[PDB]
């Protein structure tokens, strides 16, 4: 069952050849992961040590681990509102790893045949135990996480079969201490226990809102670069403006820079940012003499 | 060609192309690819669906006693088409579009395939979709003179009223003596769009059989077999009471196995009446 | 994986009723036919997840000795028509060949029925 | 003698364009000199092209054709072999006039100006200034006018004339379907210009591809541009269940509307269809007008053909207006 | 058998006696002329191998003396619906939910046939080789017609028979003319010899 | 018309996808044995590398060309092309959500001096709201107009193709040939058509459209140096699109088309009277205050209604009461049916 090559004429077999599977698993080779470091993530931090501690401590204290007899833990679940740190702790615990890594998107892994999405999950944790150690990161799970139900006319077992292939590959038989899995869905409900065995994927952490600190926190990362006044307080830019889930406050920087040269100064101040906020919504509503 | 489809070839000096036409298979481009020669035409797409869907059973005259029935749709399906002459002076438009309502059986699938071959016409069915609208129009165009029928299912959303009336689109308009034919179990089932006087210039009526003409259906498929030098059928028609065509095919046929039991070669009296006595379930 | 009954844990009720149901009559056949009737053949073990399904068959598969085939049942099915039946007639002519013999599908809801009416393509494959 | 250099083609040229020619579907065009052509096989080739064809019709990829042993673009695929042959692109007219139409006037001259008139006399608008308006739709109540009659008519004196339906436009197998009304919208804009028919659009009979397919409509009328695409007639007998998102007055234009008949077109249609017929003695409205309280333009249709039928049994074209009765409970009672 | 039919040229030696219209005939390497017609080889006529009585099949007398009617008495009793009328019913739909009397007693009936009961399961008319399946198929058919009287038994057919198809990717292009000529070749016996096409399926 | 003689040196060639490098390499022929074979005499090793399709000839099966790789059914999407007439002077009755469309669309022009000068990268997406009424699009036809760019155009549903996973493989196609291409955009139309938030798994019903959508908003942000795709999208609802489409990333600065008031109004009709011959004193204000709350992209119906009045009264101008004659005909009688405020609470 192994890849060996064969003359074309005379057809009998000259060498062997490692073996192999297509590009679109080869696609998944990132080389270009650290710019992202664990300054530029803020306001998470017992996150970072969560899933820090959960993933590249293994990768080099395994032993110290093994002094104390535990087994080491399994795919780590980063699931969130909207749009909190996912991504960003994705490539950024795949930015000072050391290791291989690789970027395994949710809908690459279903397609229009029966067998390309199954074999290639399966050549997925091939890859990464023919490289191992490496670390997975499996983006939007909602792709492969619309679950088994009693299915009359129409149903679908296409993505049935990547899924269940998937989560068999991870917690069917024994050999899994190799590879380490971060998965990282905006929803959870959607999802049967099949894909949450206390084992297929280890911790659950959660991803909250950033809190009352954490916005002004974001706010000083981002504008890092712009040229920011001294007589400016990111304490009120927090306080004022708490609804938003950290996505937002990265770019009530970018357009309140924005905005700032659209003034034309270019040095920007508190009211760039203050009024770079009535920007992020807005949805008009005037006639308003009577809010009193 | 046929495993790989495509091409562009010559033809041989003795081949006078100008016969040869379209969907008529002969080849000979044998390694250069030139032609030579014609052969057995090779059943044309029709002639698919008609074997294939083998349901229509020639049926003729055979009809268990409607004559009523039979005068009307061939008020309507044989002079609109052998005799138009006087209705293109009669003022009349033109007759077309006949609805079958009636229980399930005792007319359907065999009125319109009988005066469809009395007529020599054609009988091409659309009842089901399963191997392959509007591709069929041209068909029955180069057919010139064409019948199309449907189906009835409701029991033993929008089913075929949707192609019936996308005929009737194309239809309404319309190369000319091509007649739909609906067959349903009731008139009060289907689409209102079809509630269009007159979208259905014809709405005939099947009753199920009363005593007599359940003496001639019986009657009919009783001289299918051998029975004896004396039957006098009524007593069988005794108990017809809402009977169905099909309910005395069957009937007939179970009278003969009755007879085939005890390895007799003569139906008798009493097969029938175990027949028609075993099939009230 | 050398796993044994030991590491099976609470649920010795089950594994010793599909220890016997399952290997039972390769150790003693003439018992069954004694009684008049012809052995079992199939178990379907469901139940919520985690539980020791996958494994459990991985202690059946340390503790016997005819060729346990285990396969997911997912790994079975490929994009070429007509293949996944000749996978599964070559596995249980496989099975025809070596005797007695145990074949472990896991997971099977990709082979998992109540059948459709209309894929067409992606299911009446299967 | 210009006609002196042709023939060196069949002695130069036509041995190479002249062989048993293969036909494979055109890909992705490299520049000038080559192409790739992926064969009836599924194999890619990337082939060379001809100096003296003249290259047309390369849209990556249209059925190229190709050479046998060499591999190039030998030729092209004229014989296009039109998709939806059965689209009702009309050469042979149907029977209906100004005249025989000859009840709703004001609505067919409003539909007689908005399709016709870019066409019959199309110098008055830039003349004027104004653009011409789109197509309209024309709903009513069911038998009020033929709804497709209006239309038919105004194919009889213009150029192509091409219709859908909301049974062409919906999908079974599909889930795959919003193609119908991009290729009806492709076919439709290329011939400059036809008119297309959304034929009784009513959306009836999981839901989600009937609102893509109605979005398709709605963005594929009126996305970025525009050939001449007047003739979006749409006939309705349902305004109050469509999605009102159709008309912004751009994806659909002034549109117009008609009362049933009233009993000027009871009597001024029914007068049509029996001007065919042979009836003379005791033609008459009091059967007529206040007979059903309202009798649609069909059922004067239907009790025109049911009345000469009736009284066609019977074998006489006669005048009889009893016969006429009897086919008055015969088709509506 | 390498895909397509094509045109030929036959020798002059070989009678015109033996060519049917599924005659399989064997060609010659580099030319494609025929040379001989063949013995029918394609599937097993099954000798003595399915083991349960149709006495301990319980309970199941009226289907019993149906599939007993209508399918081994008229292949021994062939010539006395030649003596009343009623033809042999060509072939038999077994629909059974959930199952119960499938396959005992189409187990059962292959005791006492006399007559080659040819199995094959309905599921590898499909092949992995494109356009094989149909000439499968009808070397089963002519299988059992050079050894009749025959039962053909086909299980399952909602494998190779549904009602809806797919005309765009040939995942069924093929399996919708493994049931077209199929349907043509159950057409082609109405002379009556004796081929007994019975077929079972859990659903219908 | 002579090219008899330089066909014998051309080789037609059959692509095939390349693979691992060992030196040899292992080609892929999709229809034949995907076999190893090494370069020919002058392509660099640094050229040629996995993924990609190079041509194989086909009498000693080895490799000459490498080739671009393949888009096939969305060839005709691309960036349209020569592109619509109107532009910023046309699309009128707004002044200020141009202003704010115009400096994300326009920043490969001058601007980026700008933005690499005081530190910013601008916005990616934009979003345009509105009901069916306003230059949803037109401005878009406008940002089309000039753009100094690409315009790849992809509306709604030829994304909604069904195969179950195929419109996923459009998506990431569409995004493939759009990083092949410096300073290009996208432009989404009708993006509600993939929407239905994020469903139940019992009779699910819009999955396979979940997972087109959901990799686009995999590749609007996840794991790229992103190129500078400035997307912008125009639908008329909002949430029935969920979130993680519409945050700031993929998105920010989302326009609200609304219904234009009493004084930009005049100004659209204004776009309108640029026509017609009209007659010399006409009161367009007037006009603005009799329709008042209709829409933006309609007022050419009371423009077009109105010559057409006039060309039926055999005039060669355009007078009042045609005017406000057509005020009555396509504002009163064509409110009957035609709704926008079915949308509006949509907004
Ligand atoms: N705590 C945080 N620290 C830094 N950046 C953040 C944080 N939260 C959100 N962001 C911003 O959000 C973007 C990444 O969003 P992300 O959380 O990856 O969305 P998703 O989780 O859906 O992938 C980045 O541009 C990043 O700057
Ligand atoms: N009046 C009749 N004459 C002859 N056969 C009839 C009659 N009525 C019913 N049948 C039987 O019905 C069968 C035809 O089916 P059909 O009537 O088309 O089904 P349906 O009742 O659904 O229309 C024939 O086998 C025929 O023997
Ligand atoms: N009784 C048990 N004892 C020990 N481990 C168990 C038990 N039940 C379930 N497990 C856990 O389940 C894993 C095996 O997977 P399993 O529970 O079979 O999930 P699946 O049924 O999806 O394969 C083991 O690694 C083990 O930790
Ligand atoms: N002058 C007329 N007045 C009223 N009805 C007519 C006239 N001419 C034709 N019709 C009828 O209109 C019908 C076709 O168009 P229409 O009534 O709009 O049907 P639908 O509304 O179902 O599309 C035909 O049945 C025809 O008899
Ligand atoms: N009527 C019956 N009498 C005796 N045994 C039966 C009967 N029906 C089913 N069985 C037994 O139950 C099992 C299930 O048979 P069934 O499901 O009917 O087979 P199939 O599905 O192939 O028709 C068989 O192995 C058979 O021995
Ligand atoms: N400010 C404006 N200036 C000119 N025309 C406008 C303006 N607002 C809307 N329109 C008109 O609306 C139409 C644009 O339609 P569009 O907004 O794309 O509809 P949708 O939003 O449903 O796609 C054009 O015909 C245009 O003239």
Do not use: W
């Amino acid at each position: 069952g192994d890849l060996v090559g064969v003359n074309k004429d005379s057809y009998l077999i000259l060498e062997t050849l490692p073996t192999e599977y297509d590009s679109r698993v080869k696609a998944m080779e990132v080389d270009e992961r650290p710019t992202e470091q664990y300054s530029d993530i803020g306001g998470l931090d017992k996150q970072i040590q969560e899933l820090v501690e959960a993933i590249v401590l293994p990768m080099n204290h395994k032993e110290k681990f093994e002094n104390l007899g535990i087994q080491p833990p399994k795919g780590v679940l980063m699931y969130g509102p909207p749009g909190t740190g996912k991504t960003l702790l994705a490539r950024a615990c795949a930015a000072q790893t050391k290791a291989t890594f690789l970027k395994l998107a949710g809908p690459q892994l279903v397609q229009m045949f029966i067998g390309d999405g199954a074999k290639l999950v399966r050549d997925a944790f091939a890859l990464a135990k023919e490289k191992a150690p490496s670390i997975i990161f499996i983006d939007e799970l909602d792709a492969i996480g619309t679950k088994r139900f009693d299915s009359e006319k129409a149903g679908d077992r296409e993505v049935q079969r990547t899924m269940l292939e998937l989560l068999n590959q991870l917690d069917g038989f024994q050999p899994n201490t190799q590879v380490k899995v971060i998965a990282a869905t905006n929803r959870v409900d959607i999802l049967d226990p099949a894909l949450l065995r206390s084992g297929r994927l280890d911790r659950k952490i959660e991803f909250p809102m950033p809190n009352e600190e954490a916005r002004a926190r974001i706010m000083q990362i981002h504008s890092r670069k712009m040229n920011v006044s001294p007589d400016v307080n990111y304490e009120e830019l927090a306080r004022c403006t708490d609804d938003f889930n950290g996505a937002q406050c990265k770019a009530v920087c970018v357009e309140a820079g924005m905005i700032a040269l659209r003034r034309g100064a270019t040095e920007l101040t508190h009211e760039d940012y203050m009024e770079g906020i009535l920007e992020v919504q807005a949805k008009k509503k005037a006639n308003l003499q009577y809010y009193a | 060609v046929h495993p790989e489809g495509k091409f562009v070839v010559d033809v041989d000096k003795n081949i006078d192309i100008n016969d040869v036409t379209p969907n008529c298979r002969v080849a000979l481009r044998n390694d250069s690819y030139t032609l030579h020669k014609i052969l057995p035409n090779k059943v044309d797409p029709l002639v698919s669906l008609m074997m294939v869907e083998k349901v229509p059973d020639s049926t003729y005259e055979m009809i268990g006693g409607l004559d009523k029935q039979i005068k009307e749709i061939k008020e309507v399906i044989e002079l609109p088409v052998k005799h138009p002459e006087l209705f293109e002076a009669l003022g009349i438009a033109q007759p077309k579009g006949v609805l079958l309502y009636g229980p399930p059986g005792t007319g359907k699938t065999l009125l319109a395939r009988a005066v469809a071959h009395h007529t020599d016409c054609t009988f091409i069915r659309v009842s089901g979709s399963e191997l392959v609208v509007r591709e069929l129009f041209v068909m029955a165009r180069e057919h010139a003179p064409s019948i199309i029928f449907m189906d009835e299912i409701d029991s033993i959303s929008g089913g075929d009223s949707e192609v019936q009336r996308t005929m009737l689109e194309l239809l309404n308009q319309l190369t000319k003596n091509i007649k739909v034919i609906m067959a349903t179990n009731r008139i009060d089932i289907l689409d209102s769009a079809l509630l269009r006087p007159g979208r259905i210039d014809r709405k005939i009526e099947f009753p199920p059989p009363n005593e007599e003409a359940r003496l001639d259906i019986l009657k009919i498929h009783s001289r299918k077999m051998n029975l004896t030098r004396g039957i006098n059928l009524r007593k069988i028609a005794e108990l017809m009471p809402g009977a169905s065509g099909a309910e005395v095919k069957g009937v007939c046929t179970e009278a003969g196995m009755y007879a085939l039991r005890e390895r007799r070669v003569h139906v008798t009296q009493e097969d029938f009446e175990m027949a028609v006595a075993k099939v009230m379930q | 994986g050398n796993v044994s009954y030991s590491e099976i844990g609470g649920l010795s009720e089950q594994i010793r009723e599909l220890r016997e149901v399952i290997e039972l009559p390769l150790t003693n056949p003439e018992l069954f036919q004694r009684v008049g009737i012809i052995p079992p053949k199939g178990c379907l073990l469901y139940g919520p997840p985690g539980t020791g399904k996958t494994l459990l068959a991985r202690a059946v598969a340390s503790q016997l000795d005819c060729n346990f085939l285990k396969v997911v049942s997912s790994s079975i099915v490929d994009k070429y028509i007509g293949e996944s039946a000749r996978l599964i007639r070559e596995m249980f002519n496989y099975a025809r060949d070596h005797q007695p013999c145990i074949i472990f599908m896991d997971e099977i809801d990709a082979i998992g029925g109540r059948r459709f009416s209309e894929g067409t393509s992606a299911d009446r494959e299967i | 003698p210009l006609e002196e250099k042709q023939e060196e083609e069949r002695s130069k040229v036509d041995d190479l364009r002249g062989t048993p020619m293969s036909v494979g579907t055109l890909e992705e065009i490299i520049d000038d000199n080559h192409a790739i052509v992926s064969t009836s096989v599924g194999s890619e080739h990337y082939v060379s092209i001809l100096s003296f064809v003249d290259k047309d019709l390369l849209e990556p990829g249209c059925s190229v054709l190709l050479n046998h042993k060499v591999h190039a673009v030998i030729g092209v695929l004229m014989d296009d072999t039109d998709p939806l042959v059965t689209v009702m692109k009309v050469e042979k007219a149907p029977q209906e006039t100004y005249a025989d139409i000859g009840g709703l006037d004001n609505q067919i001259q409003e539909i007689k100006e908005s399709v016709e008139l870019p066409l019959t006399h199309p110098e008055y608008y830039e003349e004027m200034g104004i653009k011409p308006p789109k197509g309209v739709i024309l709903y009513g109540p069911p038998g009020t006018g033929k709804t497709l009659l209006a239309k038919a008519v105004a194919n009889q004196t213009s150029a192509t004339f091409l219709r859908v339906v909301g049974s062409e436009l919906i999908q079974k197998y599909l889930g795959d379907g919003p193609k119908l009304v991009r290729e009806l919208f492709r076919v439709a804009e290329e011939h400059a210009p036809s008119i297309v028919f959304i034929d009784e659009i009513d959306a009836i009979g999981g839901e989600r591809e009937i609102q893509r397919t109605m979005l398709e409509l709605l963005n594929q009328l009126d996305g970025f541009d525009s050939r001449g695409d007047v003739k979006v007639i749409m006939a309705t007998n349902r305004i109050e269940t469509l999605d009102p998102a159709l008309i912004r007055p751009g994806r659909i234009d002034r549109k117009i509307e008609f009362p049933l008949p009233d009993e000027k077109t009871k009597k001024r249609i029914f007068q049509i269809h029996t001007s065919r017929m042979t009836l003379a003695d005791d033609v008459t409205l009091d059967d007529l007008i206040m007979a059903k309280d309202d009798l649609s333009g069909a059922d004067i249709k239907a009790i025109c053909t049911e009345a000469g039928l009736m009284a066609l049994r019977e074998r006489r074209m006669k005048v009889t207006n009893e016969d006429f009765k009897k086919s008055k409970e015969n088709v509506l009672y | 058998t390498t895909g397509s039919n094509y045109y030929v040229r036959i020798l002059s030696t070989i009678d015109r006696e033996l060519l049917k219209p599924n005659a399989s005939v064997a060609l010659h390497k580099h030319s494609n002329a025929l040379v001989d017609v063949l013995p029918p080889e394609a599937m097993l006529t099954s000798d003595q191998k399915p083991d349960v009585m149709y006495a301990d099949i319980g309970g199941m007398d009226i289907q019993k003396q149906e599939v007993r009617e209508a399918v081994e008495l008229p292949l021994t009793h062939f010539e006395l619906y030649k003596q009343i009328g009623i033809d042999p019913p060509r072939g038999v739909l077994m629909y059974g939910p959930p199952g119960c009397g499938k396959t005992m007693l189409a187990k059962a009936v292959a005791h006492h046939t006399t007559a080659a009961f040819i199995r094959v399961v309905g599921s590898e008319f499909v092949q992995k080789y494109l356009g094989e399946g149909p000439r499968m198929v009808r070397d089963v058919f002519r299988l059992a017609k050079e050894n009749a009287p025959a039962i053909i038994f086909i299980d399952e057919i909602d494998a190779i028979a549904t009602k809806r198809f797919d005309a765009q990717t040939g995942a069924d292009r093929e399996v919708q003319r493994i049931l077209l000529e199929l349907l043509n070749q159950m057409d082609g016996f109405d002379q009556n010899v004796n081929v007994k096409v019975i077929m079972a399926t859990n659903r219908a | 018309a002579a090219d008899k003689q330089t066909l014998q040196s051309e080789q037609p060639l059959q692509v095939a996808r390349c693979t691992k490098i060992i030196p040899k390499y292992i080609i892929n022929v999709k229809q034949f044995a995907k076999f190893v074979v090494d370069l020919s005499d002058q392509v660099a090793p640094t050229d040629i590398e996995e993924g990609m399709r190079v041509g194989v000839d086909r009498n000693k099966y080895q490799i000459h060309i490498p080739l671009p790789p393949k888009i096939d059914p969305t060839v005709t999407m691309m960036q349209v092309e020569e592109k619509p007439d109107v532009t910023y002077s046309d699309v009128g009755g707004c002044k200020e959500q141009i202003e704010k469309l115009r400096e994300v669309v326009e920043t490969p022009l001058l601007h980026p001096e700008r933005f690499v000068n005081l530190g910013i990268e601008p916005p990616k997406g934009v979003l345009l709201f509105g009901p069916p009424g306003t230059g949803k699009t037109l401005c878009a036809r406008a940002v089309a107009n000039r753009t100094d760019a690409c315009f790849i155009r992809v509306i709604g549903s030829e994304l909604v193709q069904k195969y179950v996973g195929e419109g996923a493989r459009m998506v990431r196609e569409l995004f493939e040939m759009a990083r092949t291409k410096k300073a290009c955009l996208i432009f989404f139309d009708e993006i509600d058509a993939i929407g239905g938030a994020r469903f139940d798994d019992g009779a699910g019903g819009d999955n396979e459209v979940q997972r087109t959508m959901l990799e686009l908003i995999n590749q609007l942000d996840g794991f790229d140096p992103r190129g500078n795709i400035k997307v912008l999208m125009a639908t008329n609802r909002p949430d029935t699109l969920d979130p993680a489409l519409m945050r700031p990333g993929r998105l920010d600065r989302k326009i609200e088309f609304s219904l234009p008031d009493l004084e930009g109004r005049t100004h659209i009709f204004k776009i309108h009277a640029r026509s017609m011959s009209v007659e010399r004193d006409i009161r367009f204000e007037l006009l603005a205050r009799l329709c008042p709350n209709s829409t933006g992209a309609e007022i050419r119906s009371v423009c077009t209604e109105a010559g057409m009045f006039a060309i039926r009264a055999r005039r060669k101008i355009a007078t009042e009461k045609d005017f406000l004659e057509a005020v009555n005909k396509v504002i009163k009688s064509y409110a009957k049916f035609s709704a926008t405020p079915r949308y509006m609470t949509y907004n």
